[PDB]
Amino acid sequence: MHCPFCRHPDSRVVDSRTTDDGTSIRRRRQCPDCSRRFTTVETCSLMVVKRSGVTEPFSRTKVINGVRKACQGRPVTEDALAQLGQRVEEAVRATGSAELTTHDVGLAILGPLQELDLVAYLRFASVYRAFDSLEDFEAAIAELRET
Amino acid sequence: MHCPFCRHPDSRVVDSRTTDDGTSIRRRRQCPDCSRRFTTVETCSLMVVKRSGVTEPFSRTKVINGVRKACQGRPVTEDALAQLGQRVEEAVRATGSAELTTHDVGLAILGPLQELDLVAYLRFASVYRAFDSLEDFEAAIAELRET
Amino acid sequence: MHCPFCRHPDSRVVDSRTTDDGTSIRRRRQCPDCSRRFTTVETCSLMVVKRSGVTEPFSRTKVINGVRKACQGRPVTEDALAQLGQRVEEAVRATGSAELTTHDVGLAILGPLQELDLVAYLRFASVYRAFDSLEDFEAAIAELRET
Amino acid sequence: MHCPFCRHPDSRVVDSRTTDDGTSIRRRRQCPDCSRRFTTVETCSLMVVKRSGVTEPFSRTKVINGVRKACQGRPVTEDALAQLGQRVEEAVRATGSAELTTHDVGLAILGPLQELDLVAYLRFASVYRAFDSLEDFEAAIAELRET
Amino acid sequence: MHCPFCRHPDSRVVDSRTTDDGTSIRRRRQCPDCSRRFTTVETCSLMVVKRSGVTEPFSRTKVINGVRKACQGRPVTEDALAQLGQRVEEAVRATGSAELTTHDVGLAILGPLQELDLVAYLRFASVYRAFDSLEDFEAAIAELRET
Amino acid sequence: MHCPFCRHPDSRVVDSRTTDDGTSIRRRRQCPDCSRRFTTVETCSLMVVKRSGVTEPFSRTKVINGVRKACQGRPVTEDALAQLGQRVEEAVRATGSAELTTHDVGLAILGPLQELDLVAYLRFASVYRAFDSLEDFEAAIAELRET
Amino acid sequence: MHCPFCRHPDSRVVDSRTTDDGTSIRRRRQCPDCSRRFTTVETCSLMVVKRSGVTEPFSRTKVINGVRKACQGRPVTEDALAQLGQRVEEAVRATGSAELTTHDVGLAILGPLQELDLVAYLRFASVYRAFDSLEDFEAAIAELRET
Amino acid sequence: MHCPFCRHPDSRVVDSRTTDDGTSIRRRRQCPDCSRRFTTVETCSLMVVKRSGVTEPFSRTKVINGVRKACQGRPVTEDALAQLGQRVEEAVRATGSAELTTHDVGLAILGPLQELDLVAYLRFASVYRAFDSLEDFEAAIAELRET
Amino acid sequence: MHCPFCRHPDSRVVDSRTTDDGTSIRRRRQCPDCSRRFTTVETCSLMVVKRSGVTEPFSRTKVINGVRKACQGRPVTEDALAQLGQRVEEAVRATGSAELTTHDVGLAILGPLQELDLVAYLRFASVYRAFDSLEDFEAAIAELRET
Amino acid sequence: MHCPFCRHPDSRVVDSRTTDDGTSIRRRRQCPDCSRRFTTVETCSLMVVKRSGVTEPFSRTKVINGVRKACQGRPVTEDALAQLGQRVEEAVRATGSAELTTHDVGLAILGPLQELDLVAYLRFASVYRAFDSLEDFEAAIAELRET
Amino acid sequence: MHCPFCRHPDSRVVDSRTTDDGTSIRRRRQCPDCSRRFTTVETCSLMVVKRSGVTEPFSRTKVINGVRKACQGRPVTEDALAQLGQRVEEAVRATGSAELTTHDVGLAILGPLQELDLVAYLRFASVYRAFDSLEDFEAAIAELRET
Amino acid sequence: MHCPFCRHPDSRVVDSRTTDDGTSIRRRRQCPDCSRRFTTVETCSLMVVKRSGVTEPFSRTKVINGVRKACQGRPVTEDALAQLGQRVEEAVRATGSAELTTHDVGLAILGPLQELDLVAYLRFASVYRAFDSLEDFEAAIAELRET
Ligand SMILES: Nc1ncnc2c1ncn2[C@@H]1O[C@H](COP(=O)(O)OP(=O)(O)OP(=O)(O)O)[C@@H](O)[C@H]1O
Ligand SMILES: Nc1ncnc2c1ncn2[C@@H]1O[C@H](COP(=O)(O)OP(=O)(O)OP(=O)(O)O)[C@@H](O)[C@H]1O
Ligand SMILES: Nc1ncnc2c1ncn2[C@@H]1O[C@H](COP(=O)(O)OP(=O)(O)OP(=O)(O)O)[C@@H](O)[C@H]1O
Ligand SMILES: Nc1ncnc2c1ncn2[C@@H]1O[C@H](COP(=O)(O)OP(=O)(O)OP(=O)(O)O)[C@@H](O)[C@H]1O
Ligand SMILES: Nc1ncnc2c1ncn2[C@@H]1O[C@H](COP(=O)(O)OP(=O)(O)OP(=O)(O)O)[C@@H](O)[C@H]1O
Ligand SMILES: Nc1ncnc2c1ncn2[C@@H]1O[C@H](COP(=O)(O)OP(=O)(O)OP(=O)(O)O)[C@@H](O)[C@H]1O
Ligand SMILES: Nc1ncnc2c1ncn2[C@@H]1O[C@H](COP(=O)(O)OP(=O)(O)OP(=O)(O)O)[C@@H](O)[C@H]1O
Ligand SMILES: Nc1ncnc2c1ncn2[C@@H]1O[C@H](COP(=O)(O)OP(=O)(O)OP(=O)(O)O)[C@@H](O)[C@H]1O
Ligand SMILES: [Zn+2]
Ligand SMILES: [Zn+2]
Ligand SMILES: [Zn+2]
Ligand SMILES: [Zn+2]
Ligand SMILES: [Zn+2]
Ligand SMILES: [Zn+2]
Ligand SMILES: [Zn+2]
Ligand SMILES: [Zn+2]
Ligand SMILES: [Zn+2]
Ligand SMILES: [Zn+2]
Ligand SMILES: [Zn+2]
Ligand SMILES: [Zn+2]
């Protein structure tokens, strides 16, 4: 990493410790040229921006609850819901963005949910793909037969 | 009744009053321990059996909130939702079923909801008409085109 | 209470039980004339309507937290904050309304908060009394000297 | 680093990459237990000491949210709030204090906030200028009339 | 359904069978985790609302046990208790009340119990006829002498 | 205490310790004449003999539950029930017997229960005083008017 | 299942939910002909009838404790006892009866216990097979040599 | 001694009395906190070391209950069991062992139990004579035929 | 307090917060002349120096345990021991020293212990007052008679 | 025996060996679960009954530690303490008491301790000779002067 | 095992029970010749002697903490540290000694620690192998290259 | 500040006093609940950021203890350690770093420690100079030979 003071191309790591909660790693680095020591923090935090304008930490439990409610009346097991939540969280974190919108969360859910149950996928994409008339629903039923 | 402040198991009744309509009784109570007064209302409210064994008081607010969450992203005004809720409550009161469940409450909304919107109606009716297959959605789409 | 079926002026109570959680009392009444038995529930539930349009149960902890944050930098004890929360909850419940707006909650807070601390009261009423210019603040400082 | 999915204490580093700017490092990590990959970013971020001993990364979002909550009920646009946050961040970066606390961050907002509004400025400056008395509010009101 | 052995949340259905009478369905299920099979029976059983909001399946065994505990120390044979339970169940089935409570079940026992015994009847009827005063007991003693 | 070995009229206590659970006190005594050390245990254990022939430790919770069920439909508070249980336990222990029958427990309950509620006392003594006909109940109602 | 009202040969399931505790599944069915909706409950409850005449829920812990006491002084591990309890519970539930006698529980235990330990099996069957004289014990020792 | 009512750690001694026999001391105690009195008895009771390190007071009731549970299903009267318990207690008192264990107590029952019954004796002696093999049972059956 | 930078005679407090654990108070002060802000911490920590050379936080539980062991065989209650520990802690903290030796702790204990029990005080001062011969013990017994 | 590593309830015995002296048996055991071996030693050790009901193996180390803590601040060498411990163990082994308590172990130390020191002896003998009064200490001081 | 009374070459085991905490097994044995019953205890206790002269039970957590601190700044995982602690405990227990010195504990740690990390092994053996000058460190670095 | 005795959240300030030096303030406080007084000291102490985010007051005692534990087994006197600690504290005070971490404190010890000893210096400098390889130890050994 570039030294904050002299902008040297590289620096050496002289201390590293994982935080007690395990979320972040605190490192202390020293610049080889100017011999100056600076502190850096490495995190894996993820945030979702609510439609009301408030950002809150990502939660797999809320995704599982939402997909469970959307799968009401269908034969879905708890192991399948947990696996779907894990897949959604992994796919969301793979983008690398620190914060994302809940619409993108729903779009990510749309993938595994189709493999889970077709009725729940249809009644979920009717909201998150913005269906406007019966024709849009009929086209979606046709895409599912093609896939 | 348990005190709302200090959770004392028993509370006296300072006074009681029957409303002019006669379907409600309003009581003022005082906790023997903390000597802090509060108020209670007793009504012969219509109960609905949930999907579990728990019975819950009927509330038009929950019906309106559910249909609005089903109507999100659609051009549905609040006046139409209020009229739909009033019609559903009137229907469930007029039927006078021996054992009223929340499934029957969800069934009473399909009628009024069909006139308001078709996308929201299809979403809502996909649950309480127990949709098992995509072909069942197509049959409802054909019925909506006929109506 | 009036009998739901025959609208008799009064009815007799033949059963009563406090709920396990203690929030409500379930009574069973019998009409003296038509000999018909009906069930009533007595509750003390209280709800606050958020500015976002969602109603949630009243909480004294949130009131205490808000007044504590508004009293930042001032000599306020935890016993005083707990007593203020108790007073606010008692005054709110005394109105008898099942649901109220958070603006009314702030107006109720405005009473005891003035007795608690003047600076916090000023910086709280500047929001909940809708002060517009410096003149409104100066008039409030004058009312506090008069009181 | 603890795995975000299964909370395994240690995680390998699949790969690392230094950004073009050079002030950040982006790493892809994999959990040895569940074999689920995620991403982390390490930056030499400016830390602020809170009112407790806990140090928190600097975020313009928190400053903007706080000033907006102070500016509620006032004709303040979002562009003005963004400009105020940018000015505050630039000021705190330019001062280069040896030990930067959140109190100094709250002090850097009074300047820009005085131009935007007077009610919101008086609310915000009543805290970080440590207002003890009503007369202190009057002196600030006189200063605002002069400026 | 949760497995009775290892409490796994979901269980498959190995097979199902409809009984000759047609009012019951007997299923054999297997837990996916432990692969241990068990059996379940589904019936459209008559539910009674307890003194709380909890609904419980009707059981003549509970009625017989309660009346026997009320008949302790009295010359009442088991055949008479069985006949009383059968009569009470037949009465509650024949009335076909819209909302059947345990209070009505306790009321259906007073009739048959009056013939069997007078001490046990007076004990049992002191509850469900809501006896408030000693004079109410005397009026029931006079009624028993008349009958 | 008499020495177990030589039957000396008195002995001296040389060690004493209360048990960790606090139920018993273990003492070590030495005989002044023969200089012999022996161990004694002091207990306050109390047992009730069930009608099935099994002896179990005395419990105030069971007494409270029984009197609560016998007071069904009557205005009895939890503090009153706890005080009645305490009085029953104290009166039972005052006799000094290590074991007693549940009939004696009911006879002890009969005292405070009359002061608590007359209806519950009547329906409890009808079982624990062995009433045989309506005449026995009428005589009991007369004794209550006299007292 | 047959419709309770019109006795139609079959009915359709329109709602299903597993209970929170997971013991039962509540279904709502609708008759295709008369369009009437009725509620059914599916359970896996099991009861054992004590020799005193009281029925209590089946417990694997009590079976394990009994076989452990019967295996006193013998080399039996806790894993073996847990497996024996699981086998006993599975064999008991395989019969399909909702309630069974403890004698049948002992007869079920007699199977795996013989494979576990011969001495414990002998001293357990001497009670649950009703041995009368030494000849019955000698014959049992001979059956074990044959098997 | 801990109070039986409120569990206060220490209790005073209101009075003490030595019995006429001299082997017991009866004390009346009062709790300083709740001021509720109770009674205690101190005796130099004979202790038996259980299979663990815990020592328990000797009780003929436990011996009689154990032998009766061993004698279930056999024509053994209660008088014979009482005589057996008296003989066992007399034997264990007369031996005067330095360290008396419950194993020795179980050994003192085989003698008297041999005369009462043979099936119950064989069951009981299969434990405390440490039966390892079926041949050991056969040798005891041969000994019983000789005696 | 003097300003750390310019040594001004006095400074103003502009921020104060009690720590979450409540042990310390963190204040932020500003010098009136040089307008410089500095952080101070107020603590009430107390340490005892073990004879092995290690300093550990003061504990009332250890003092109570020590005095309890020194009072073995004497009539001392738990309330008295707790009060003695409280008195010892208060007297130790009254000196104002952050760290003290365990010998001073014993000297502080010597005060209340004499009022508690004379035998324990003698056997405790024989260690913490360094008695050398029987004459020193005799003189101490004489001082106790004088006091 | 529970495994020391993973706490598995049962452990096999890899091998056993009887020592040359014959008073000990050394076994090597292996846990079935983790397959980690350990060693155990079984001896017919002399047990002492503590002040509670718990029996503890006799250990000269505890006696030496206790007397040393009593001898602190006194010119007592470690060789003298070892000789005292050896003498006490020899005495308690030679007496062969039927029921050996820790009080008798504390009594066996007074003899040897009288020769070693007088201050430490007086401290130690103030406990196990049950000193009630200062005059009892004076009588022991007179006895020490005579001896 | 040899009989404690008559020194017979072998004895038979007639009772065995594992302790509730699982640390020890209590056996009761009987001598075939003199027919005398004696109690033995089998334990797996392990103790470490601190350099201050106090013996305390062996703890794997302390070993893990020590090696973790010695591995500061090195890539060591928690699973590796737990495995090293398990190996150290197993190797220590394999010697069969009931008590050992902490120097031997460090010597045991020296084995796996070399396989874990070379820098930590060097900085740990510099203390537990008593390095005196730079030459001793250089020789150790040479042994590591050879191994 | 929380009371050290009863943990009451808030404590009054009985009195305050500024020390002659002026860098400390000594206050006497009293708890409102228990009315037990204690003392507190407030100083503008130099804080060091630990390897985590927690800041800790600087203490020469910790530095001396750490270096002594590093110097164990070496001929280093306590006076030399005190001089080293004084030099390290003077150096860290004289540098006046903007953000002082414990890593910099560990770096300030290498200088003075090089003169005192070479083995202890090599141990201590193997951590804070971040030794990755054995060759890095050899380079430091060569540097020590040069110096
Ligand atoms: N904290 C959270 N972490 C992760 N995903 C979340 C979180 N909160 C909500 N979600 C996801 O976002 C979806 C919500 O989408 P939507 O934008 O309609 O809701 P919202 O605006 O958050 O809800 P609300 O109506 O309560 O304001 C949920 O179905 C869920 O999958
Ligand atoms: N207490 C109530 N009063 C009136 N209408 C209700 C009540 N509870 C639910 N409803 C409405 O009746 C329908 C019942 O929906 P649904 O079967 O999903 O409810 P539920 O029992 O709450 O389900 P779940 O408990 O699984 O979330 C919806 O339209 C809902 O808005
Ligand atoms: N659940 C609650 N129960 C009781 N009082 C509440 C509750 N939530 C908020 N309040 C009160 O209402 C006040 C909030 O007023 P305001 O209308 O500005 O907030 P809001 O709209 O609820 O907040 P938000 O900005 O998070 O949507 C709080 O200071 C508190 O006293
Ligand atoms: N463990 C107990 N401790 C104290 N009192 C008890 C206990 N168990 C029961 N009781 C008292 O004894 C009364 C029971 O009297 P009764 O002889 O009719 O019952 P029982 O024979 O114990 O009951 P069951 O019918 O269950 O065998 C209860 O009302 C209660 O007051
Ligand atoms: N709640 C229970 N669930 C399952 N099995 C049980 C339960 N209670 C007892 N059992 C089984 O039944 C056996 C008891 O048989 P038995 O008929 O002799 O006892 P009981 O009549 O229940 O006992 P008691 O003498 O206490 O009245 C036990 O060994 C155990 O295996
Ligand atoms: N952490 C502590 N906090 C407060 N008081 C303590 C603490 N530890 C010990 N004490 C007090 O100090 C006394 C100990 O005095 P002493 O100097 O003989 O012990 P020590 O050197 O600490 O013990 P050890 O022999 O275990 O090293 C105890 O009786 C107790 O009152
Ligand atoms: N297991 C043991 N083996 C040998 N000697 C012991 C043992 N336990 C205690 N002792 C010694 O015997 C005497 C008993 O002292 P004391 O009565 O105070 O012990 P205690 O039962 O441990 O007391 P407490 O449990 O109340 O601390 C002391 O001299 C003690 O060192
Ligand atoms: N209770 C324990 N159980 C097992 N191992 C231990 C225990 N306590 C310490 N150890 C081991 O012994 C090592 C300590 O060696 P050392 O002799 O230097 O310490 P010590 O004398 O016990 O410590 P102290 O300086 O605190 O008195 C630790 O690194 C650890 O591996
Ligand atoms: Zn640089
Ligand atoms: Zn209250
Ligand atoms: Zn009516
Ligand atoms: Zn993982
Ligand atoms: Zn299962
Ligand atoms: Zn004697
Ligand atoms: Zn039908
Ligand atoms: Zn008490
Ligand atoms: Zn200054
Ligand atoms: Zn293991
Ligand atoms: Zn022998
Ligand atoms: Zn206090």
Author numbering:
A (entry chain K), B (entry chain L), C (entry chain I), D (entry chain J), E (entry chain F), F (entry chain E), ...: 1 to 147
What do the paper's sentences say?
The structure of ATP-loaded NrdR (2.96 Å resolution from two merged cryo-EM datasets) reveals a dodecameric assembly of three tetramers. In each tetramer, the ATP-cones of chains A and B, and those of chains C and D, interact with each other, respectively. For the Zn-ribbon, the domains of chains A and D and those of chain B and C interact, which generates an intertwined tetrameric structure. In addition, the orientation between the ATP-cone and the Zn-ribbon domains differs by ~90° in chains A and C compared to chains B and D. Perhaps related to these differences, the ATP occupancy in chains B and D is close to 100%, but lower in chains A and C. The described conformational differences allow the tetramers to assemble into a dodecamer, with occluded Zn-ribbon domains, unable to bind DNA. The bases of the outer site nucleotides stack on each other in the ATP-loaded form rather than being sandwiched between the side chains of K69 and V127 and making end-to-end contacts in the dATP/ATP-loaded form. ATP-loaded NrdR forms a dodecamer that cannot bind to DNA.
